[PDB]
Amino acid sequence: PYVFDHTHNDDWNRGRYLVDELAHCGECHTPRNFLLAPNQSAYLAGADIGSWRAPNITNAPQSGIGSWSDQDLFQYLKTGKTAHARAAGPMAEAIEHSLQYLPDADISAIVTYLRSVPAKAESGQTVANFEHAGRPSSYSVANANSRRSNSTLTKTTDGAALYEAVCASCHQSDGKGSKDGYYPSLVGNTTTGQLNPNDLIASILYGVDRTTDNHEILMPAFGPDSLVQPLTDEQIATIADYVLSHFGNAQATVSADAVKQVRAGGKQ
Amino acid sequence: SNETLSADVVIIGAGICGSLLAHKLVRNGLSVLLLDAGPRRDRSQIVENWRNMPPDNKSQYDYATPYPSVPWAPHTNYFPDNNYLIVKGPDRTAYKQGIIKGVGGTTWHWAASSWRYLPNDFKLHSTYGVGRDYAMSYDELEPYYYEAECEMGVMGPNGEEITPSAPRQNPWPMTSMPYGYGDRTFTEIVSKLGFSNTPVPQARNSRPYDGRPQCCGNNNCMPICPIGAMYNGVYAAIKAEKLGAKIIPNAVVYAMETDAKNRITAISFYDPDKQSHRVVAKTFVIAANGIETPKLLLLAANDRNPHGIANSSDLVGRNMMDHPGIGMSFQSAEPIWAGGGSVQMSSITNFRDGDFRSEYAATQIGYNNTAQNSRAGMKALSMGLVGKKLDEEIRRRTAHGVDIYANHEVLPDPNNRLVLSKDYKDALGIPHPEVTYDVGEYVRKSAAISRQRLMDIAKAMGGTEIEMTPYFTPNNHITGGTIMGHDPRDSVVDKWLRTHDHSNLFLATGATMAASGTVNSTLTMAALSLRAADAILNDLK
Amino acid sequence: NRDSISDFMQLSAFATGHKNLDLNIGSALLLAFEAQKHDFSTQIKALREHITKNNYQDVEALDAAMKDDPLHPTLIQIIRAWYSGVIEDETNAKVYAFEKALMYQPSRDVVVIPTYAHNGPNYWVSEPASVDVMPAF
Ligand SMILES: Cc1cc2nc3c(=O)[nH]c(=O)nc-3n(C[C@H](O)[C@H](O)[C@H](O)COP(=O)(O)OP(=O)(O)OC[C@H]3O[C@@H](n4cnc5c(N)ncnc54)[C@H](O)[C@@H]3O)c2cc1C
Ligand code: HEC
Ligand code: HEC
Ligand code: F3S
């Protein structure tokens, strides 16, 4: 049974009940302390769940969601879609199964409680995950002319070329997405802006699949099991490196080994 | 080359037909060896190749240059005519068909117009006295039509009534996505002419389907979708390989061996280095398309089968069929803004059936929704304009440029024949295919009215610079070369696509189709391949 | 080496009428032009000198006055290279620009550049803009 902390209003207590007991955000947003128990030292400070990573959602202005606007947090929790963040994987499943059916008051209470979570900053954090500006594209159309009369992407090792061929239709060559926002901007995106590129790699490996209000939004998978365009670990690492260096956190790096580990369900 | 590469079923050709058949067979516990003469192709590399294709090759419809042609298994290229498919006869231009060799085949660059044939199309001779009847009825192919539609993710006009249209037992898996501006405008314009412009059923995602994205109107279905929002035959190959099917690219089948009962015992294929490998199987299927299936059958002629494999009726390579097209290009008086949505979104289906089919061919008239920006840019640049005039001309010609087509049904003619070329060979020494084509008085009488209808459409749109092709154009649906039927003396395969001569050999191709129909034929080929899969499963289990 | 690309870029901005031109595309086009024609830099200088001496205000006046001048073909070729993205008229011609080629810009607000999404999946339900309103680029 939930205990009502009388030093806070009813909205805060309801939000705490929803976060801790009902929607159990800490069940995958709070790191387990290697005893398979939540670490009370780092509550809602980010954790690894399989191939995905639930980021820091404390009130840290840079490491967490402290700099998120209340409107953006509400919209993300209700629909999973925001100009700076899109829910994918476990977050998409959590939103489309539990959160999308929550009342507006309940999501507002969750936001109110989240704004009071003590901040858990990170070592390499100076700007927020959605505050990485874009760099101009380095793709060359002319340099692709030598790769004509090729039937496969094997000899396409350039990161810009790979991003343009596999990825620049929906997201644009500048990485700013579509005008209507259906294709998210990779610039200013929380997934590409994280210092931990896990969620980026997973996003490439499995795509995105979120059904909100009976409307389905899908990024196709690009891993070995892809139907649209299978990509090797090296190719995914190169595309992720280009995305990070041009549209996202430039202090984050992706190696083929990292993509391989993400493919294997992360650390065991 | 020493290994004999055994399997339960070996399927020659990894296009839509072969890959769908392989996927259905491995799903049911059969060992499958899928051979393709072409190489493995990556969608993104083809996208890059098309993007770096010259704009003149985009303006005119170059659908082969993005796919590099391999010397051991060349496919057709027409901007520089590579002279692979030789065409003769008065209507040679109408059989300059486009094919793509590789895992996924020509469905790599099709428009994904997935059409069901009318019930009368299967009984054309019994209904109108022309052409030939299919060995099976529409009701027999309906479940396989639906299975193909569900696997390929076809979207169709679910809630609408189209008077000539195949009766469906189930709705389309997806509903047709809304028209772009060009299709709405064309529908409204031609409704006043008595023409019913209706949505084309498309293997395209109007919603996220099969783990693939919803169509965002890249308007490049021909020749490559960058995001896989439409169905490509490579999907079935990938799914089959995931389920255990063995795919061998660059495997050019050239020889076939038969026993005393004329059953196929083995096949022999070449690698790009012309090393021979002998595959042995319990069941052999050729799904190599309507040009390469008869070409292989004629090339694999044995002592038991001197005129070609499964050619006891001398009909292999005969009755070659397609939809002879007449193209018109003009500048609409009012903006049409082609490019919203897929390249083919709607067509006039009013003339798909009628009593007139006893006299002249039934036709499909359609509007091309491909974006006209490359065409407009090249034309304005060739006009010698500079500055603001050049920009205004480009904008006006991309807003007003209209491409219209009228395709016709051709009857199966034994003299419309594919043979092995006596003058041209590829890098492996295999003779090139040579097709002699004549559309016939049926198509000519139909075209006398189709040209008038196209001119009426252009007049209703206030068209200027009207350019109608003075010849018949190919529409890339190759059928009839391995015709089906009930009489072994007048057909090659039976109602189950099994050859009359060889109880062991199945031919999962459009070449088995006895009538070309009025609309695109690949969905019927896929349904026939699934039906042949049922027959093979009955044989081997 | 740097004056040649600056001169080519300024002459290209004059000839196309559009100031915002990609520098990398311009460098590639200049290299291709100098491979095709060894005197191309001399012709660029001659065109620039003709523009500065007669004080032509736009490419329209220059093209009108250059009708019989032997330097006119190079002006038209430069405009074609920037608008179509190619210099030669073959099938194997190198494409130096797609989606940034200037001939796709007059209709970008309405017509999709094919392999790049205009916007999300069902945008075409909207009504197109007027033909008489030229997008700025
Ligand atoms: C531009 C274009 C647009 C089209 N649009 C439509 C459309 O909108 N709707 C529609 O219904 N149809 C359309 N089509 C037609 C469609 O592409 C074909 O009907 C379809 O691909 C069926 O071909 P298939 O599966 O029989 O064989 P294909 O896929 O053509 O070829 C199968 C495979 O056989 C292999 N092969 C050939 N010879 C050998 C050999 N000797 N040994 C081994 N392997 C071999 C090839 O390498 C190839 O990969 C279009 C075609 C083109 C060119
Ligand atoms: C495990 C199934 C989760 C539960 C329960 C909750 N979240 Fe989550 N969240 C999870 C993942 C794997 C991700 C990453 C998404 C991506 O595409 O990589 C997220 C994301 C968020 C975010 C966005 C943070 C950012 O991207 O920087 C927020 C604000 C967030 N999650 C909050 C949140 C809340 C409030 C939850 C309780 C209702 C909650 N999450 C549950 C995994 C899981
Ligand atoms: C169109 C079919 C796409 C292609 C090709 C690529 N992406 Fe994508 N991506 C697409 C959608 C529709 C979405 C999100 C759904 C939404 O809620 O609207 C995404 C998502 C991403 C993300 C995550 C964004 C977030 O979680 O905040 C990333 C990092 C991403 N996409 C990257 C990416 C890359 C690197 C691609 C090239 C391989 C690529 N995408 C292709 C649509 C499409
Ligand atoms: S190119 Fe692809 S995105 Fe749609 S318009 Fe054709 S299926």
Coordinates of C-alpha atoms in Angstrom, one line a residue, chain C:
Chain C
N1 CA 44.2 27.7 -57.2
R2 CA 42.0 29.7 -54.8
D3 CA 41.3 32.6 -57.1
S4 CA 40.0 30.2 -59.8
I5 CA 37.4 28.7 -57.5
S6 CA 36.4 32.2 -56.1
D7 CA 36.1 33.5 -59.7
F8 CA 34.1 30.4 -60.7
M9 CA 31.8 30.7 -57.7
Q10 CA 31.1 34.4 -58.3
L11 CA 30.5 33.8 -62.0
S12 CA 28.2 30.8 -61.1
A13 CA 26.2 32.9 -58.7
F14 CA 25.8 35.6 -61.4
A15 CA 25.0 33.1 -64.2
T16 CA 22.5 31.0 -62.2
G17 CA 21.1 34.1 -60.5
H18 CA 21.3 32.3 -57.1
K19 CA 23.8 33.4 -54.5
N20 CA 23.5 30.3 -52.3
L21 CA 25.7 27.8 -54.1
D22 CA 27.5 24.9 -52.4
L23 CA 31.2 25.4 -52.4
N24 CA 32.1 21.7 -52.6
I25 CA 29.8 21.2 -55.6
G26 CA 31.4 24.3 -57.1
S27 CA 34.9 22.9 -56.5
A28 CA 34.0 19.6 -58.1
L29 CA 32.3 21.3 -61.1
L30 CA 35.4 23.5 -61.6
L31 CA 37.7 20.5 -61.5
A32 CA 35.6 18.7 -64.0
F33 CA 35.4 21.7 -66.3
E34 CA 39.1 22.3 -66.1
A35 CA 39.6 18.6 -67.0
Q36 CA 37.2 18.9 -70.0
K37 CA 38.5 22.3 -71.2
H38 CA 42.1 23.4 -70.4
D39 CA 41.3 27.1 -71.0
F40 CA 38.2 27.1 -68.8
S41 CA 39.8 29.4 -66.2
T42 CA 40.7 31.8 -69.0
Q43 CA 37.0 31.7 -70.2
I44 CA 35.8 32.3 -66.6
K45 CA 38.1 35.4 -66.4
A46 CA 36.9 36.6 -69.8
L47 CA 33.2 36.2 -68.8
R48 CA 33.9 38.0 -65.5
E49 CA 35.7 40.8 -67.3
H50 CA 32.8 41.2 -69.8
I51 CA 30.4 41.4 -66.9
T52 CA 32.4 44.0 -65.0
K53 CA 33.2 46.1 -68.1
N54 CA 29.7 46.4 -69.4
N55 CA 28.2 46.3 -65.9
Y56 CA 25.6 43.7 -66.7
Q57 CA 23.1 43.5 -63.8
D58 CA 21.9 39.9 -64.3
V59 CA 22.5 36.8 -66.5
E60 CA 19.6 37.9 -68.7
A61 CA 21.4 41.0 -70.0
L62 CA 24.6 39.1 -70.3
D63 CA 23.0 36.2 -72.3
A64 CA 21.2 38.8 -74.5
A65 CA 24.4 40.6 -75.3
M66 CA 26.4 37.4 -75.6
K67 CA 24.3 35.8 -78.3
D68 CA 27.1 35.6 -80.9
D69 CA 30.0 35.7 -78.6
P70 CA 32.1 32.5 -78.5
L71 CA 32.1 32.7 -74.7
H72 CA 28.3 32.1 -74.6
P73 CA 28.5 28.3 -74.9
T74 CA 30.6 28.2 -71.7
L75 CA 28.1 30.4 -69.9
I76 CA 25.3 28.0 -70.9
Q77 CA 27.4 25.0 -69.9
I78 CA 28.0 26.5 -66.5
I79 CA 24.3 27.1 -66.0
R80 CA 23.5 23.6 -67.1
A81 CA 26.1 22.1 -64.8
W82 CA 24.7 23.9 -61.8
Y83 CA 21.1 23.2 -62.7
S84 CA 21.2 19.6 -63.9
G85 CA 24.3 18.5 -61.9
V86 CA 26.1 17.1 -64.9
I87 CA 28.5 18.4 -67.4
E88 CA 28.4 15.8 -70.2
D89 CA 25.3 14.5 -72.0
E90 CA 26.0 10.7 -71.7
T91 CA 24.7 7.9 -69.5
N92 CA 28.0 7.5 -67.8
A93 CA 28.3 11.2 -67.1
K94 CA 29.3 12.0 -63.5
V95 CA 26.6 13.6 -61.4
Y96 CA 28.0 16.4 -59.2
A97 CA 24.7 17.3 -57.7
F98 CA 21.3 15.8 -56.9
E99 CA 18.8 17.4 -54.6
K100 CA 21.0 20.5 -54.6
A101 CA 21.0 20.8 -58.4
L102 CA 19.2 24.1 -59.1
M103 CA 16.6 22.5 -61.4
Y104 CA 14.8 20.8 -58.6
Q105 CA 14.6 24.0 -56.5
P106 CA 11.8 25.8 -58.4
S107 CA 9.4 23.0 -57.5
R108 CA 10.8 21.8 -54.1
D109 CA 7.9 23.4 -52.2
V110 CA 5.4 21.1 -54.0
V111 CA 7.1 18.3 -56.0
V112 CA 9.2 15.7 -54.2
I113 CA 12.8 15.1 -55.2
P114 CA 12.2 11.4 -55.6
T115 CA 14.5 9.4 -53.3
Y116 CA 14.2 12.1 -50.6
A117 CA 10.9 12.5 -48.6
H118 CA 9.1 15.8 -49.1
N119 CA 7.6 15.2 -45.6
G120 CA 5.7 12.5 -43.7
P121 CA 3.7 9.7 -45.2
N122 CA 0.4 11.2 -46.4
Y123 CA 1.3 14.8 -47.2
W124 CA -0.1 14.8 -50.7
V125 CA -3.6 15.2 -49.4
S126 CA -2.8 18.9 -49.1
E127 CA -3.4 21.3 -51.9
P128 CA -0.3 22.4 -53.9
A129 CA 1.0 26.0 -53.9
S130 CA 0.4 28.3 -56.9
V131 CA 2.6 27.9 -60.0
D132 CA 3.1 31.7 -60.1
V133 CA 4.8 31.8 -56.7
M134 CA 8.5 30.9 -57.2
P135 CA 10.2 29.5 -54.1
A136 CA 13.2 31.6 -53.0
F137 CA 16.6 29.8 -53.4

